[PDB]
Design a protein around this ligand. Structure first.
Ligand code: CL
Ligand code: CL
Ligand code: CL
Ligand code: CL
Ligand code: CL
Length: 441
């Protein structure tokens, strides 16, 4: 009738009719390829609406399991990523629990599984984790053992020895340390397995010989990759970061201290924590009904503006501006005024938000030429194509450690960030200090 015959034979896929990636062998009297092709050859005949008689997979039976795996946020992401195609590599730093990601996939899929590991030490490990998380004692091929089971852990070397026999036995095939797989001997071994579902795991998918270019014919592409940074939701910067502590000028201290006692004596009467988030919201709420609080709130706000914009920071910037000798620098501050005073003190040009773009472009291109070896902008380019690039960056408040800002500095700070420096100046003993160590991130 209509039925094409599709069969496994000693590590090969054998078909009556052509399908892409097949080739005809007079010897077998059939079209054939390495049995990796099985999924695509099956799918294609289905998509081309041709009906197929199939003697390809002879699956071992999947055991009863008790899944005890509670996945982390990223772990579960991975699983979901994988399940789209069910044929690919999941990259995650070591320590991040690759094993549990894989065993969850095993738990979901409920099909016989071969987990291939490069070392006998890793056998023992997977043995232990499968017992722990799936409540099943797997079969072991390697280390002197040879028991075959619905879930089986095997060495790369033994898989090679056993490739033809085991090629159509496990629908799900998992390679641990999958960067080993493209090596000599191993690379051929994987292509004999008809296994439709394939999963690789590694922290280090790239190889120097670049033989990782093969992954698509062995396991599948990378379908999920995440740095340690990316998992924690932190940003890490290539450059160095240097804190420099100025102290207030003696004029600034006196008014600072004044405003502070005004805020403090208010919170003595009303009993608020300056350091608490809801006690702050209380103050602001009480400020729109009471003048006394409102003076206390506005004192608080000013005491910061003093410390954040302290002259002493301009006085240290003089010391720094000589040591780094006008080597393509950018100085930052969120306060518009503080741009201008630094601008005037050192004879540096200013890049502010209220500047013509033809003026902002011309001053930056004069930076680009090497004419100006220092420049200041209080505002920063946001959603902005012409990101300036330069050796050194200075930030004039403790708000320089904010993460949204740091990543903007990252692309801009270095063309080659050879531990290229970012310094920030911070007023000792003040609300500027504390902002610089403000946990928010
Ligand atoms: Cl070994
Ligand atoms: Cl564990
Ligand atoms: Cl090799
Ligand atoms: Cl190798
Ligand atoms: Cl605090």
């Amino acid at each position: 009738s209509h039925m094409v015959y599709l069969r496994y034979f000693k590590g090969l896929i054998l078909s009556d009719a052509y399908a892409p990636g097949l080739k005809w062998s007079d010897e077998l009297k059939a079209y054939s390829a390495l049995a990796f092709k099985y999924r695509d050859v099956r799918k294609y005949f289905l998509e081309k609406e041709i009906e197929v008689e199939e003697n390809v997979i002879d699956s071992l039976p999947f055991p009863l399991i008790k899944d005890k795996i509670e996945l982390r946020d990223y772990q579960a992401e991975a699983v979901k990523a994988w399940l789209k195609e069910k044929r690919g590599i999941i990259v995650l730093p070591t320590g991040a629990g690759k094993t549990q990601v894989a065993l969850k996939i095993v738990s979901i899929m409920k099909v016989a599984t071969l987990i291939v590991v490069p070392t006998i030490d890793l056998i023992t490990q997977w043995k232990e984790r499968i017992n722990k998380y799936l409540d099943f004692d797997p079969g072991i091929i390697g280390g002197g053992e040879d028991s075959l089971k619905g879930i089986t852990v095997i060495t790369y070397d033994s898989a090679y020895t056993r490739a033809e026999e085991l090629g159509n036995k496990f629908p799900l095939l998992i390679f641990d340390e999958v960067h080993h797989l493209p090596s000599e001997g191993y690379s051929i071994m994987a292509q004999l397995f008809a296994s439709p579902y394939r999963l690789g795991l590694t922290a280090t998918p790239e190889r120097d010989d670049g033989k990782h270019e093969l992954y698509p014919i062995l396991v599948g592409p990378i379908v999920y990759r995440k740095s340690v940074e990316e998992l924690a939701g932190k940003y890490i910067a290539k450059y160095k970061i240097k804190k420099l502590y100025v102290s207030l000028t003696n004029e600034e201290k006196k008014r600072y201290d004044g405003l502070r006692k005004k805020l403090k004596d208010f919170l003595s009467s009303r009993g608020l924590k300056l350091q608490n988030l809801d006690d702050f919201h209380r103050l602001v709420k009480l400020a729109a009904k009471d003048k006394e609080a409102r003076e206390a709130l506005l004192a608080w706000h000013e005491s910061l503006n003093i410390a954040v914009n302290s002259q002493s920071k301009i006085e240290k910037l003089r010391e720094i501006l000589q040591e780094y000798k006008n080597e393509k620098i950018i100085v930052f501050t969120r306060d518009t005024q503080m741009a201008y005073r630094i601008s005037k003190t050192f004879l540096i040009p200013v890049v502010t938000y209220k500047t013509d773009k033809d003026e902002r472009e011309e001053i930056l291109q004069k930076f680009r030429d090497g004419e100006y070896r220092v420049i200041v902008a209080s505002t920063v380019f946001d959603e902005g194509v012409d990101v300036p690039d330069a050796t050194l960056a200075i930030v004039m408040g403790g708000y320089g450690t904010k993460r949204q800002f740091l990543q903007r500095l990252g692309r801009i700070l270095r063309k080659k960030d050879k531990e290229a420096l970012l310094i920030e100046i911070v007023t000792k003993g003040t609300a500027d200090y504390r902002l610089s160590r403000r946990r928010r991130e």
